[PDB]
């Protein structure tokens, strides 16, 4: 068991989040510098996020080692992820949420039901905290519990596109993102984000408190903004190239507006409706936690 | 001598792997092991195709 550092697991260099910038490694923050925004006439007012349902999926015992990290990252960032709403993985997740469970979440992101000493794993109190909320991803599909798939993205815009004045205001113009870019810039960016061990991120988000958690939200704002970026590219109504002085500039329109696009395209990853429900629920929980 | 034992070669286990295939899936690239590596690794690979 890896004891959690006072600043969270993400302080460890083992969990550094990085993305290739036309093939060279870079911090997410230095990618976000590339983005620039042409505002349009429309506005995004952020609605209050409804408080997430208390009901966790039942902690039913299941065969095998469930791979929770790959499941989440694929459902959010992978190219055509499948069976993202299958119940078994989150059944095991809620099993992790029990006060004295035998299950462990390894740094591999796999949930081993054994007390397997050979593989290092996160501190059980921390993952209990983490599953205690994220098991709710299991009710992304159930009609009773579906998150708003439209208004929630307003928040995404603010946390990505939004200037500090716009963020404190809670309202921003709908924006058109753009950056100097390579072929497959958006796809490859997603491929880099998908390899992120976001379990370290979510576990730190759920287990850290007070000054440590605040320092975490400040230190990791750009990371969260990158994941948000990948979602916005999955839902952007249109994504195109603008040649300018022998330099292509990728353009995504629009940030903060879920188009509910489901059909696949070359430019970016795409959400089928099940992926829409999943991501929307994900954002419901994650933003609820982020704004506390 | 008493026939206390049933001497045999190449024993069968109490358990065996079974395996169901969806035949529409097939890797396009065709792997080419050396004949020796095919002699050892092969019965496994044909089963878990």
């Amino acid at each position: 068991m890896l004891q959690q550092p006072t600043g969270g697991y993400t302080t460890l260099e083992q969990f550094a989040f990085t993305i290739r910038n036309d093939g060279t490694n870079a911090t997410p923050t230095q990618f976000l510098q590339l983005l620039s925004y042409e505002a349009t006439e429309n506005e995004l007012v952020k609605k209050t996020i409804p408080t997430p349902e208390t009901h966790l999926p039942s902690a039913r015992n299941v065969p095998g080692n469930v791979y929770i990290e790959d499941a989440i990252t694929q459902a959010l960032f992978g190219i055509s992820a499948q069976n993202v709403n299958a119940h078994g993985y989150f059944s095991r997740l809620s099993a992790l949420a029990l006060p004295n469970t035998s299950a462990r979440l390894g740094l591999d992101g796999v949930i081993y039901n054994s007390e397997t000493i050979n593989i290092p794993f996160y501190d059980p109190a921390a993952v209990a905290n983490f599953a205690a909320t994220y098991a709710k991803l299991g009710n992304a599909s159930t009609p009773r519990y579906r998150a708003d798939m439209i208004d929630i993205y307003a928040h995404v815009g603010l946390e990505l596109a939004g200037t500090d004045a716009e963020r404190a205001a809670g309202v921003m113009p709908v924006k058109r993102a753009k950056f100097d870019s390579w072929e497959g810039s958006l796809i490859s960016l997603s491929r880099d984000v998908v390899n992120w061990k976001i379990l370290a991120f979510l576990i730190d988000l759920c287990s850290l408190e007070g000054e440590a958690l605040r320092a975490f939200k400040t230190r990791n704002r750009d990371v969260f903004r990158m994941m948000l970026f990948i979602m916005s590219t999955a839902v952007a109504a249109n994504v195109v190239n603008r040649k300018v002085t022998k330099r292509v500039d990728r353009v995504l329109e629009y940030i903060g507006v879920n188009s509910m696009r489901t059909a696949g395209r070359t430019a970016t990853i795409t959400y089928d409706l099940s992926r829409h429900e999943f991501a929307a629920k994900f954002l419901q929980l994650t933003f609820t936690r982020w704004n506390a | 001598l008493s026939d206390d034992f049933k001497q045999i070669s190449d024993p069968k286990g109490y358990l065996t792997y079974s395996v169901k295939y969806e035949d529409q899936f097939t890797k396009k690239d065709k792997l080419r092991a050396s004949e020796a590596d095919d002699r050892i690794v092969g019965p496994t690979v044909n089963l878990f195709k």
């Binding site: 015992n61 299941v62 065969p63 095998g64 080692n65 791979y67 790959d70 499941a71 694929q74 459902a75 992978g78 190219i79 055509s80 992820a81 499948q82 069976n83 993202v84 299958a86 078994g88 993985y89 000493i117 050979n118 998908v194 059909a263 696949g264 | 792997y17 969806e22 529409q24 899936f25 878990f48 195709k49």
Partner: protein
């Protein structure tokens, strides 16, 4: 095989029912141009307990060319451990750590 609800409610106790359960994981994505389904596939029968106890492995194909499909099952490590004979003769797994 098929099982009407009538038969499930009226089959004699002590008879072994033989239910069948699809693993839909190896179902390739629908053509973009296939007509929408107006209706809905439904289901009545479910297990109360895990069924795939006998299952060693699952979905031996690639999502993408590099990702694993969700729900894919790798073989257990013990399937491959072939350790040693004990001091007396009995089979053993390899030591977990050096000690």
């Amino acid at each position: 095989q098929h099982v009407d609800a009538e038969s499930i409610m009226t089959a004699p106790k002590g008879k072994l029912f033989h239910l069948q359960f699809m693993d839909g994981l190896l179902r390739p994505e629908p053509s973009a141009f296939d007509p929408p389904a107006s209706g809905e596939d439904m289901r009545l029968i479910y297990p109360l307990q895990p069924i795939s106890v006998a299952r060693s492995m699952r979905a031996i194909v690639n999502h993408n060319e590099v990702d694993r499909p969700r729900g894919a099952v790798a073989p257990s490590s013990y399937e491959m451990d072939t350790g040693t004979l004990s001091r007396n003769g009995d089979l053993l797994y390899s030591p977990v750590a050096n000690g």
